[PDB]
Amino acid sequence: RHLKSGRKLNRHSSHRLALYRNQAKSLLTHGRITTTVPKAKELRGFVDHLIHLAKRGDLHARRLVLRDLQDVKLVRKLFDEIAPRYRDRQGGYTRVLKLAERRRGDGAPLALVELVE
């Protein structure tokens, strides 16, 4: 027994990280992302941080963000377009809404991971 602690899984470390890294990229790229509930929830916090460093905009934040999102252009958009969109918002730049119906293939329950507004 454990879970006395936090964070989810079902992949080894390097994979689990690489995962959040990709959803993040895909989310900042499209605004709305559809994935399974667990993956969606675990995403919210990881990207909220990324955007919060954007709000700073001091380069260090930039190079910190680039560590997870390697796409220079992506970050640019992140720092010039998405970031301002909040700047006054105190956290919670991410939204997650579960859809009805599941994958008629494995029955996985899906959800929405939206960039909020």
Binding site: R32, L97, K98, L99, A100, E101, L112, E114
Partner: protein, 59 residues
């Protein structure tokens, strides 16, 4: 083909008695407030679209 095997054929009664719990339970739905439709609670269904909540198509 190995080690433990069942000793006797489980009788029809005994077999069915075990499935006394396999009975399925109905999906839980509720009337959508925006349209006339049934959908699961705390979920965005196609029909309506959620007072904006990133919905399907509609003109």
């Amino acid at each position: 083909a190995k080690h433990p095997v069942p000793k006797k054929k489980t009788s029809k009664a005994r077999r069915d008695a075990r499935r006394s719990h396999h009975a399925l339970t109905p999906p839980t739905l509720v009337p959508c407030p925006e349209c006339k439709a049934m959908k699961p609670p705390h979920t965005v269904c196609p029909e309506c679209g959620y007072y904006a909540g990133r919905k399907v198509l509609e003109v």
